[PDB]
Amino acid sequence: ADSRKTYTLTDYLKNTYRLKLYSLRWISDHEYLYKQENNILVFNAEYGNSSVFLENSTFDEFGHSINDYSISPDGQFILLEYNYVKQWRHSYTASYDIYDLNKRQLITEERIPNNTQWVTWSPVGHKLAYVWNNDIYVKIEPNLPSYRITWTGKEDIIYNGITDWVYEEEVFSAYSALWWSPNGTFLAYAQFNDTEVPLIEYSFYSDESLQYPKTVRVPYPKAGAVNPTVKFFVVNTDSLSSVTNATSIQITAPASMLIGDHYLCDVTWATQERISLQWLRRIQNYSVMDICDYDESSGRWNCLVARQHIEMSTTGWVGRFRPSEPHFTLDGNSFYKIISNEEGYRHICYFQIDKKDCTFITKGTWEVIGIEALTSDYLYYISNEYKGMPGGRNLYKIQLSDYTKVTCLSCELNPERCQYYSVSFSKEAKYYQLRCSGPGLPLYTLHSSVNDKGLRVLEDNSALDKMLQNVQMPSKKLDFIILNETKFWYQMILPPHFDKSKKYPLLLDVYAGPCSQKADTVFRLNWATYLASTENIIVASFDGRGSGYQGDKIMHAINRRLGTFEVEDQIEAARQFSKMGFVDNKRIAIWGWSYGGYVTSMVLGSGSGVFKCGIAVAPVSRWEYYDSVYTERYMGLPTPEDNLDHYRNSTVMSRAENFKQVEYLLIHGTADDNVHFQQSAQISKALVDVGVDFQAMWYTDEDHGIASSTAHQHIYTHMSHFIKQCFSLP
Amino acid sequence: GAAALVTIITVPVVLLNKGTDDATADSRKTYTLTDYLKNTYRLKLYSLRWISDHEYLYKQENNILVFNAEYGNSSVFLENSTFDEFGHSINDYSISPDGQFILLEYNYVKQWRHSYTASYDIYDLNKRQLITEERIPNNTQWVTWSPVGHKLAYVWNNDIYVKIEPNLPSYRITWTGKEDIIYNGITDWVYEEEVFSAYSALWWSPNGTFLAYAQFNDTEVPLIEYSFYSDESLQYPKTVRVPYPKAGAVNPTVKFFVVNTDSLSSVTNATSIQITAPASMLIGDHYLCDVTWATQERISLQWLRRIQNYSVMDICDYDESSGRWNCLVARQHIEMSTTGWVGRFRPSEPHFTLDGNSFYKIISNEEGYRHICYFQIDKKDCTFITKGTWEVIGIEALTSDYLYYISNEYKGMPGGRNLYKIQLSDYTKVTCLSCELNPERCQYYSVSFSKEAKYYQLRCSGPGLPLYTLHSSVNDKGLRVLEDNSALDKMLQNVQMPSKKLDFIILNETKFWYQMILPPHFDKSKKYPLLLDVYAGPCSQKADTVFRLNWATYLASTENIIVASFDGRGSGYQGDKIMHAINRRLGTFEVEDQIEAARQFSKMGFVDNKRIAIWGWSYGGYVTSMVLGSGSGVFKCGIAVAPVSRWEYYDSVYTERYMGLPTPEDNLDHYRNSTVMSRAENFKQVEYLLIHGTADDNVHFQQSAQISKALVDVGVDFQAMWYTDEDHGIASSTAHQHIYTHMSHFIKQCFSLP
Ligand SMILES: *[C@@H]1O[C@H](CO)[C@@H](O[C@@H]2O[C@H](CO)[C@@H](O[C@@H]3O[C@H](CO)[C@@H](O)[C@H](O)[C@@H]3O)[C@H](O)[C@H]2NC(C)=O)[C@H](O)[C@H]1NC(C)=O
Ligand SMILES: *[C@@H]1O[C@H](CO)[C@@H](O[C@@H]2O[C@H](CO)[C@@H](O[C@@H]3O[C@H](CO)[C@@H](O)[C@H](O)[C@@H]3O)[C@H](O)[C@H]2NC(C)=O)[C@H](O)[C@H]1NC(C)=O
Ligand SMILES: *[C@@H]1O[C@H](CO)[C@@H](O[C@@H]2O[C@H](CO)[C@@H](O)[C@H](O)[C@H]2NC(C)=O)[C@H](O)[C@H]1NC(C)=O
Ligand SMILES: *[C@@H]1O[C@H](CO)[C@@H](O[C@@H]2O[C@H](CO)[C@@H](O)[C@H](O)[C@H]2NC(C)=O)[C@H](O)[C@H]1NC(C)=O
Ligand SMILES: *[C@@H]1O[C@H](CO)[C@@H](O[C@@H]2O[C@H](CO)[C@@H](O)[C@H](O)[C@H]2NC(C)=O)[C@H](O)[C@H]1NC(C)=O
Ligand SMILES: *[C@@H]1O[C@H](CO)[C@@H](O[C@@H]2O[C@H](CO)[C@@H](O)[C@H](O)[C@H]2NC(C)=O)[C@H](O)[C@H]1NC(C)=O
Ligand SMILES: *[C@@H]1O[C@H](CO)[C@@H](O[C@@H]2O[C@H](CO)[C@@H](O)[C@H](O)[C@H]2NC(C)=O)[C@H](O)[C@H]1NC(C)=O
Ligand SMILES: *[C@@H]1O[C@H](CO)[C@@H](O[C@@H]2O[C@H](CO)[C@@H](O)[C@H](O)[C@H]2NC(C)=O)[C@H](O)[C@H]1NC(C)=O
Ligand SMILES: *[C@@H]1O[C@H](CO)[C@@H](O[C@@H]2O[C@H](CO)[C@@H](O)[C@H](O)[C@H]2NC(C)=O)[C@H](O)[C@H]1NC(C)=O
Ligand SMILES: *[C@@H]1O[C@H](CO)[C@@H](O[C@@H]2O[C@H](CO)[C@@H](O)[C@H](O)[C@H]2NC(C)=O)[C@H](O)[C@H]1NC(C)=O
Ligand SMILES: *[C@@H]1O[C@H](CO)[C@@H](O[C@@H]2O[C@H](CO)[C@@H](O)[C@H](O)[C@H]2NC(C)=O)[C@H](O)[C@H]1NC(C)=O
Ligand SMILES: *[C@@H]1O[C@H](CO)[C@@H](O)[C@H](O)[C@H]1NC(C)=O
Ligand SMILES: *[C@@H]1O[C@H](CO)[C@@H](O)[C@H](O)[C@H]1NC(C)=O
Ligand SMILES: *[C@@H]1O[C@H](CO)[C@@H](O)[C@H](O)[C@H]1NC(C)=O
């Protein structure tokens, strides 16, 4: 028997073994900013030598705690975020202090206002664009009076320059609607109108001191509810006048998008006077990307119907979540974007503003994960082609002049330790930092694009290795199970000292979200590590119909059929795992979060009998309750004419009776902005009405993530007890 | 054994078997949780409505029947088929005093404990037809017949309307009606759940000439906000806002009014004279405790200041010339309590004599025990007509020759209740009316007299099966038995029902009573797991002689768990000394005694020390949480259902009455030293199950949420369960069954039961 310690839940809850990382900020095509011992340091990318940029002492007397720093492209001033207060996933409010780096002084005039919602440095220069009270303001110079752009900003009504809840969590996936022109002359902002959007009302219990609970209302368009109205405007920052209100040029949306509900999915600056706006109709199966240019005579941005590019998908939704960002060339008369080929595998395609033909430069059964950098000679991109593994990531470069000349830059660096390579290029793609998150310890290495040569290893996580060498860390097994001749991959965190002769319990961690991957090669220290190392449980995950990075066919398989194919596949995988031999048929469990929790609820209510017990955290019960953008993209409109029937059938409440055959633990946070507590409330009510005896746990004032240190520890501690009790483990 | 003995061995085997049988041969069924949830064994009841001095109405086979008490015969007042063609299920019926009309309630909707809304249809008994004209409006909040005659006054949209004749149009009285702002004729949440303890602020005059109404103002009262999930169809949850004055928050404004119904005309509006509170009450926030009509021209109002330790009763007489009711300062009776709060829960209702120049009322004596006091309207002297170490539970009847009251004097048992009558002319002449009726089966008695108290139904609650008997006051003669629960008795013979023991332990030379539901086949030698059911509310009695078939019965009969309840400092019907002991110190002495109670029970000899638990609701949940957080170590686990945490969260009227004001100058220290959240660290040593209904209106979910958050912060692993869209009662059939099912599971797991 090994005397090494197991990875205990304490190690997971109280991060003991930490995975070191090297995060740097490229400031130029030869230098980056890496913070060490509270000191920003400038490391010459090629030489490797380090020069102190800002000593801790500089901000030791700041009097506040700088949550995050921001360096101007010119580096003449630095933004300091203090009084940080987080709202939703990306939305946050904090105070900003602009510290001059030339006279080494803190600007004390016309300072950024308190509770600023978003501030951004100019692309090139030291200009700023802070958003305050749902309003956009532009400061030509950090020490100059601010110039106000918008004037109609209203809280929870008119969002100017900042995305609303739905857009922040689904569309732009950020809290920034400000887009500066490449040189900083033009600022492009978006006005989101939520006047009609209905409000979700949940109660916040604040602290013990609070006497009456605060009721919080958020503009949240539930499936079928009126979506927010989006308008796009462009303002000339250089022409900003303190005497007169700045004039904003509102660019109209594509005519096709003006016949119904429209969504501005992405805004990309092509040139100094060319901008590309990608829009998508209410039904997410029709997208038009406009390439509007800027006229000088009328000083009015104009859209050309000839340049418009229309992408429609009958198989399913257009774009995994939204049309990808087009990486335009320097001239701006040609752009490269990831599109799905007729076969159904998304690949890179070369387009020209005048041309209307897609010239795909990549082809195969693999799929282009993303474009990294475009530099005349080669276009760099990450793909899952290596070893035909959908759960692998590798950097590739393709000569633009000769597309046939494609070169992998990471596939043969360290095959055993690194297979999920990810990269961040420099300002001019001269030096790129390649990092691998699996299957071995995270490794961070710099490179030189000129000769594809490894400059040096920034981080090797060696300190974690020796420590891990003293722990029975559970092994990870990633393979595939052929189902209906459709290869589906699965991963298994086999317990340490695994022996297929013996029989082990199996917990199927599940998510099965549209376009999701739970069978990657990433190395992670999570609760699964504890369950496998200490509780000796085979934690496993499966990617069936609905899995992403495997082609449109599999991804669009659950189109207009949510909680159907994916649920059956997960149960099928459990059967496949059970007959593999090592899995104990009697002790099989499933646990999931959000969509995973919805799947967990569905599989427990399936009545298959394969699963014995299950835990669902903040699970979606009725798709009608969920937001419109997500549900509509994978279900449609909840209207009798459209897919209303599927919405009604796909409700956890329907399978309530079957739950009597299994143990269900329903955990949900009272203050859940995303999956509202309403979902779990209806689940509990249904189970209570039918009489299903189930355990539950509400976390007061906890978000969808339930990440608050205390709640995080308690939720996993309680979950540990449930799994151990159900699996009859000591 | 295994010797020469062969058939003799089989013979000894036989003997052994016989012996075993003598020790154990039980084959009866046990009272299972199924029996409790599905009410397999139901207790019958005979609740009659005395409609006259000689006749009453009782419902048999859905048929309203009139019964002559003296003769004992009966006649069909209304056939069940009579309303089969109504088209709606009549929830309840109200017969006009004249017996010429009846109100049919349909579309019944419930709000809080008493508040409700329903549609009413008047039925002409004389013409055997339903009144179709001027029908009572839908959603009417309250409707009441005049004391005599057939006048109808109802509250609709927070406005009081009066119908002189059922067939005639309604005459609107108040026009200031508004929702959650101005409540006219109806009581706001605070008063409904605390002061008046009802949803009726209307008071008909004795002959119906006047109508007394109250205008509650909640414009400043802060609103509690809880979300309602309704049904699956509802897409966006509805946030419900209820006027709830938390401890220290702005309390509602109360104004009293009286209107001459006889002068009501459709030509103009009807003016209402306002009876202002006495200056003493006006100095600060005041509460109209109760309104009692004395004579046709005399009314009595009880007002109590926010600090509940100073109350004044205003006897107000109407002046014909002025047309305005006036109050003589001398007639006012002031009641102040330095030791604690005035009244058990509020100033008691006075019983005025027919003449109206004298009245009897329940006042605590100098010793500290509440007793009847004869009060003359023109005197300030309180002459106590009764006295002793007992207490007058309540007055039920006031005949010109005798006063009838229920007391706990019999056998000096604070729980026992018996009917006593006292000669008005000779207070020394007091005769018990039920003490020696059936002491073996009945020790807890309640009574309902007729219009002239000629006949009275003495209903019994235990310790035996509920027994309902009618008696004649003329010579204290028992007319007959109405309900004997004989059928229930026969069925109960089959099951091994658990027994009940009510005794008292001596703490600091003071007698504190306790009750134990001993399991069937109880053996003092054997030790049983003990669950301390507890409420320990101020002026509350958990130990009594009432027969009840509840969850505890299943716990004792099937799980063989002794269920015990103890009444310590703060118990009711035991004297002011014990009741006012926790004054301005809630969650202190009461918690310690319950802990001490378990300690005494453990050393009794039949309680397993390793397996002792506790459960409670509301204040009981607060005590359950406190004893678990007391770090005593006496209890192993506990279940808290809708428990109160920080006392500031609870309503002001209740908390302020005992704890006081949550202000730095007052008891704010204890307000922040009696929070359950404070003892979170100690909870780690015990097990905990926090259950609370999401839409609870009394104990708000916020209180439970704070407890849960605190436990998570400290690191206590506790099970929990939120019942969605459930009130404090959580009595919805589904929830009721589910809550006890889950609770049973936890108890068995904690007590390691097989
Ligand atoms: C965000 O969207 C809402 C809803 O479309 C906009 O509200 C609209 O505001 C205009 C202002 O002129 C209203 O027009 C006028 O409304 C009045 C009645 O309020 C009517 O009498 C006039 O004939 C005229 O229609 C419009 O009705 C109103 N729509 C509503 C309330 O549904 C709001 O202005 C938008 N905000 C921005 C900054 O775009
Ligand atoms: C229930 O209580 C509220 C709060 O006391 C009452 O509202 C109050 O009504 C009086 C009416 O005279 C208001 O006084 C007047 O206010 C106006 C300005 O609003 C001022 O111009 C007049 O000179 C006079 O002072 C008082 O301000 C107002 N208080 C508020 C709104 O907070 C309400 O009338 C009560 N309802 C009933 C039926 O008793
Ligand atoms: C690393 O060392 C090189 C020299 O080997 C530095 O390059 C010189 O930096 C000085 C800074 O004042 C310049 O004046 C020289 O012109 C640079 N020489 C060349 C050839 O570029 C480099 O700056 C050092 N990097 C850091 C971060 O200290
Ligand atoms: C820029 O726009 C703002 C907002 O419309 C103007 O501020 C308003 O000015 C008028 C002048 O009569 C006031 O009545 C309003 O109350 C002001 N605020 C709002 C919210 O309307 C401002 O004057 C404009 N500046 C210029 C130069 O036109
Ligand atoms: C940044 O880019 C913008 C867009 O091209 C420039 O704006 C135009 O620049 C051209 C060339 O200087 C002028 O002829 C136009 O009149 C400009 N238009 C406007 C509306 O100003 C801008 O000059 C560029 N800025 C810099 C510093 O190069
Ligand atoms: C986008 O999806 C909608 C909804 O499915 C499509 O509208 C339907 O189209 C089908 C034919 O393909 C008709 O039979 C339906 O009646 C249409 N409406 C509904 C309510 O389903 C729409 O055609 C799709 N657009 C594209 C470009 O494929
Ligand atoms: C209305 O009352 C009559 C009178 O009792 C009920 O009829 C009785 O029904 C029971 C059960 O079927 C029989 O045992 C009795 O013999 C019936 N009595 C007579 C005289 O018919 C009748 O069921 C009641 N109806 C409703 C709607 O409750
Ligand atoms: C019980 O029986 C008595 C008679 O023994 C009833 O009393 C009489 O009832 C008749 C009915 O027509 C009346 O005319 C008499 O005036 C009654 N006499 C008295 C003294 O009241 C009595 O009504 C019966 N009770 C019931 C409920 O049926
Ligand atoms: C009784 O009082 C009500 C309320 O004041 C009167 O109804 C109002 O009459 C005024 C007359 O100007 C109207 O402006 C209001 O709209 C009426 N309604 C309300 C709710 O205020 C009613 O007329 C009075 N009746 C008589 C006969 O005096
Ligand atoms: C109900 O009681 C009221 C109050 O005593 C009676 O009203 C008085 O009746 C007497 C005798 O008729 C008159 O002298 C008074 O002037 C009345 N007072 C008022 C305010 O009207 C009323 O008459 C009684 N009703 C009945 C039917 O007895
Ligand atoms: C009712 O209770 C209040 C609050 O306890 C009493 O007010 C206190 O009175 C005492 C003297 O009796 C003072 O020492 C305190 O300072 C007062 N205030 C507080 C905050 O305790 C009031 O006297 C009581 N009234 C009666 C009639 O007993
Ligand atoms: C501040 O920077 C200096 C640089 O030499 C380093 O030695 C010191 O430890 C730093 N202090 C903190 C608190 O990081
Ligand atoms: C923000 O508020 C704090 C507290 O009042 C103040 O000290 C600080 O100077 C404010 N900052 C600005 C930029 O107004
Ligand atoms: C109550 O509602 C019913 C059904 O709409 C209607 O027939 C009836 O007249 C209403 N009653 C009154 C008095 O409003």
Q: A198: which chain B residues are within 8 Å (Cβ-Cβ)?
A: 236
- Give the number of other CB atoms < 10 A from CB of residue B250: 15
Pocket lining: A62 vs ligand 4, CB cutoff 6 Å: no
User: Can you read off the two tokens belonging to residue A41?
Assistant: 């340091």
Same domain, A501 and A528: yes
- Give the number of other CB atoms < 10 A from CB of residue A173: 13
CB contact under 8 Å between A688 and B735, yes or no, is yes
- Cα angle B636, A714, A539 (rounded to 5 degrees) comes to 115
Contact (CB, 8 A) for B405 and B392 = yes
CA–CA dist A457, A560 (Å, integer): 47
CA–CA dist B75, B324 (Å, integer): 47
Determine the atom of ligand 2 nearest the C-alpha atom of B220. 4
User: Can you read off the two tokens belonging to residue A13?
Assistant: 């809850």
Type of residue numbered A442: P
Looking at the DSSP bridge assignments, the partners of residue A666 are A616, A696
A697 Cα: distance to centroid of ligand 9 (angstroms):
55
Closest C-alpha among A508, A499, A294, A521 to residue A411: A521
Closest C-alpha among A313, A300, A308 to residue A256: A308
Nearest to B722 among A198, A203, A684 (CB): A684
Same domain, A565 and A614: yes
CA–CA dist A189, A178 (Å, integer): 5
CA–CA dist A713, A527 (Å, integer): 11
Q: Which helix (H) or strand (E) holds A527?
A: helix A527-533
User: Can you read off the two tokens belonging to residue A438?
Assistant: 């699996």
Closest C-alpha among B587, B591, B590, B726 to residue B646: B587
Cβ neighbours of residue A1 under 8 Å, at least 6 residues apart?
none
Q: B248: which chain A residues are within 8 Å (Cβ-Cβ)?
A: 211
Same domain, A591 and A659: yes
A297 Cα: distance to centroid of ligand 4 (angstroms):
29
Contact (CB, 8 A) for B209 and B151 = no
Domain boundaries, position A380: 366-470
User: Can you read off the two tokens belonging to residue A533?
Assistant: 């190392």
CA–CA dist B599, B383 (Å, integer): 44
Alpha carbon dihedral A46, A51, A54, A60, in 10-degree steps, equals 130
CA–CA dist A15, A85 (Å, integer): 24
Q: Which helix (H) or strand (E) holds B478?
A: strand B477-483
CA–CA dist A634, A316 (Å, integer): 8
Residue with tokens 């269900």: A664
Determine the atom of ligand 4 nearest the C-alpha atom of A244. 27
CA–CA dist B514, B544 (Å, integer): 8
Nearest to A685 among B229, B710, B737 (CB): B229
DSSP secondary structure letters along B425-468:
S-TT-EEESSTTT-TTTEEEEEEEE-TTSSEEEEEEEEESS--E
Same domain, A112 and A184: yes
Would you say residue B646 lies in a domain?
Answer: yes
B121 labelled catalytic: no
Pocket lining: A273 vs ligand 5, CB cutoff 6 Å: yes
Same domain, A535 and A653: yes
Q: Whose CA is nearest to atom 13 of ligand 11?
A: B666
A125: DSSP letter: S
Looking at the DSSP bridge assignments, the partners of residue A669 are A699
Contact (CB, 8 A) for A604 and A614 = yes
Q: Which helix (H) or strand (E) holds A281?
A: strand A274-281
Would you say residue B667 lies in a domain?
Answer: yes
Contact (CB, 8 A) for A49 and A31 = no
Contact (CB, 8 A) for B720 and A697 = yes
Q: CA quadruple A545, A547, A548, A551: dihedral positive or negative?
A: negative
Contact (CB, 8 A) for A199 and A218 = yes
- Cα angle B76, B79, B80 (rounded to 5 degrees) comes to 130
- Give the number of other CB atoms < 10 A from CB of residue A354: 10
CA–CA dist A423, A182 (Å, integer): 23
CA–CA dist A379, A56 (Å, integer): 39
Would you say residue B616 lies in a domain?
Answer: yes
- Considering every ligand atom, which ligand is closest to the CA of A230? 1
CA–CA dist A113, A28 (Å, integer): 30
Question: In Å, what is the CA distance from A704 to each residue of A563, A625, A673, B228?
Answer: 20, 15, 7, 20
CA–CA dist B670, B647 (Å, integer): 9
Question: In Å, what is the CA distance from A269 to each residue of A324, A331, A681?
Answer: 14, 12, 45
Would you say residue B575 lies in a domain?
Answer: yes
Residue B426 buriedness (CB in 10 A; 0-12 / 13-18 / 19+): exposed
Alpha carbon dihedral B735, B738, B739, B740, in 10-degree steps, equals 130
CA–CA dist A35, B347 (Å, integer): 73
Among A114, A115, A132, A137, residue to substitute to test ligand 13 (most atoms within 8 Å of Cβ): A114
- Give the number of other CB atoms < 10 A from CB of residue A486: 15
Residue with tokens 């609103």: B223
**Interface with chain B: mutation pick from A668, A714, A718, A725, highest number of B CBs within 10 Å:** A714
CA–CA dist B228, B264 (Å, integer): 42
Would you say residue B527 lies in a domain?
Answer: yes
- Give the number of other CB atoms < 10 A from CB of residue A658: 17
Closest C-alpha among A59, A96, A71, A91 to residue A81: A96
Closest C-alpha among A411, A590, A378 to residue A505: A590
CA–CA dist B563, B558 (Å, integer): 12
Cβ-count burial B483-521 (b if 16+ within 10 Å, e if not): bbbeebeeebeebbbbebebebbeeeeeebbbbbbbbbe
Residue A254 buriedness (CB in 10 A; 0-12 / 13-18 / 19+): buried
B348: DSSP letter: P
User: Can you read off the two tokens belonging to residue A474?
Assistant: 């559970």
Number of H helices, E strands in chain A: 12, 43
Cβ-count burial B10-40 (b if 16+ within 10 Å, e if not): eeeeeeeeeeeeeeeeeeeebbebebbbeee
Alpha carbons within 13 A on the beta-carbon side of A385:
23
User: Can you read off the two tokens belonging to residue B135?
Assistant: 């029908």
Same domain, A68 and A35: yes
DSSP secondary structure letters along A381-422:
EEES-GGG-TT-BEEEEEESS-TT-EEESSTTT-TTTBSBEE
Nearest to A205 among B702, B713, B725 (CB): B702
Determine the atom of ligand 12 nearest the C-alpha atom of A57. 1
Chain A nearest-CA distance from B506, in A, is 39
Give the residue from chain A lying closest to B675, CA to CA: A208
B219 Cα: distance to centroid of ligand 2 (angstroms):
9
Contact (CB, 8 A) for A68 and A78 = no
DSSP secondary structure letters along A436-473:
E-SBSS-EEEEEETTTTEEEEEEE--HHHHHHHHTB-P
A184: DSSP letter: S
CATH code, A103 = 2.140.10.30
Contact (CB, 8 A) for A595 and A512 = yes
CATH code, B690 = 3.40.50.1820
Contact (CB, 8 A) for A649 and B259 = no
Alpha carbons within 13 A on the beta-carbon side of B323:
6
Question: In Å, what is the CA distance from B736 to each residue of A177, A218, B559, B642, B723?
Answer: 51, 34, 19, 14, 10
Cβ neighbours of residue A338 under 8 Å, at least 6 residues apart?
A324, A346, A347, A348, A349, A368, A370, A371
Alpha carbon dihedral B227, B228, B231, B232, in 10-degree steps, equals 0
Question: In Å, what is the CA distance from B314 to each residue of B263, B284, B299, B317, B365?
Answer: 26, 17, 8, 10, 21
CB contact under 8 Å between A205 and B741, yes or no, is no
CA–CA dist B298, B212 (Å, integer): 12
User: Cis peptide before B643, with omega less than 30 degrees from 0?
Assistant: no
Would you say residue A120 lies in a domain?
Answer: yes
* Domain end marker among A454, A470, A486: A470
Q: φ, ψ for residue B488 (rounded to 5)?
A: -55, -45
CB pairs under 8 A between A and B: 120
Q: φ, ψ for residue B436 (rounded to 5)?
A: -110, 30
Q: φ, ψ for residue A688 (rounded to 5)?
A: -65, -45
Would you say residue A350 lies in a domain?
Answer: no
Q: Whose CA is nearest to atom 2 of ligand 9?
A: B269
User: How far apart are the two ends of chain A, measured CA to CA in Å?
Assistant: 19
Closest C-alpha among A376, A383, A461 to residue A423: A383
- Give the number of other CB atoms < 10 A from CB of residue A250: 12
Cβ-count burial B295-320 (b if 16+ within 10 Å, e if not): bebbbbbbbbbbebbbbbbbbbbbee
Same domain, A30 and A113: yes
User: Can you read off the two tokens belonging to residue B575?
Assistant: 């004297």
Q: A713: which chain B residues are within 8 Å (Cβ-Cβ)?
A: 715
Q: Whose CA is nearest to atom 9 of ligand 9?
A: B175
Same domain, A549 and A641: yes
Closest C-alpha among B695, B682, B700 to residue B735: B695
CA B57 to chain centre: 24
Same domain, A439 and A499: no
- Give the number of other CB atoms < 10 A from CB of residue B589: 16
Q: A691: which chain B residues are within 8 Å (Cβ-Cβ)?
A: 734, 737-738, 741
Would you say residue A613 lies in a domain?
Answer: yes
Contact (CB, 8 A) for A591 and A507 = yes
Give the residue from chain A lying closest to B739, CA to CA: A688
Among B58, B59, B61, residue to substitute to test ligand 7 (most atoms within 8 Å of Cβ): B61
* Domain end marker among A470, A487, A512: A470
- Please give the biggest Cα pair distance in chain B: 114
Q: φ, ψ for residue B215 (rounded to 5)?
A: -110, 105
DSSP secondary structure letters along A197-250:
SPEEEEEE---SS-SSPEEEEEE--BTTSPPPEEEEEEEESTT--SSSPPPEEE
CA–CA dist A203, A194 (Å, integer): 21
Helix, strand or coil, per DSSP, at residue B632: coil
3-state secondary structure B222-273: CEEEEEECCCCCCCCCEEEEEECCECCCCCCEEEEEEEEHHHCCCCCCCCEE
A252: DSSP letter: P
Closest C-alpha among B257, B99, B103 to residue B175: B257
Same domain, A464 and A557: no
Alpha carbon dihedral A711, A714, A715, A720, in 10-degree steps, equals 160
Catalytic residue (choose from B450, B618, B625, B645): B618
* Domain end marker among A160, A194, A228: A194
Contact (CB, 8 A) for A265 and A224 = no
Instruction: Name the method of structure determination.
Output: cryo-EM
Closest C-alpha among A47, A38, A102, A27 to residue A66: A38
Type of residue numbered B178: K
Contact (CB, 8 A) for B399 and B383 = no
Cβ neighbours of residue A188 under 8 Å, at least 6 residues apart?
A178, A179, A180, A181, A232, A233, A234, A235, A267, A269, A275
Q: Alpha-carbon Rg of chain B, whole angstroms?
A: 28
CA–CA dist B502, B492 (Å, integer): 21
Residue with tokens 């995050």: A68
What's the length of chain A? 730
Same domain, A63 and A159: yes
Looking at the DSSP bridge assignments, the partners of residue B78 are B64
* Count of domains for chain B: 1
User: How far apart are the two ends of chain B, measured CA to CA in Å?
Assistant: 33
What share of residues in chain B are helix, strand, coil (percent, to 5)?
20, 35, 45
Same domain, A489 and A544: yes
Helix, strand or coil, per DSSP, at residue B602: helix
Looking at the DSSP bridge assignments, the partners of residue A444 are A435, A459
User: Can you read off the two tokens belonging to residue B98?
Assistant: 């004249």
CA–CA dist A584, A580 (Å, integer): 10
Looking at the DSSP bridge assignments, the partners of residue B387 are none
Contact (CB, 8 A) for B464 and B476 = no
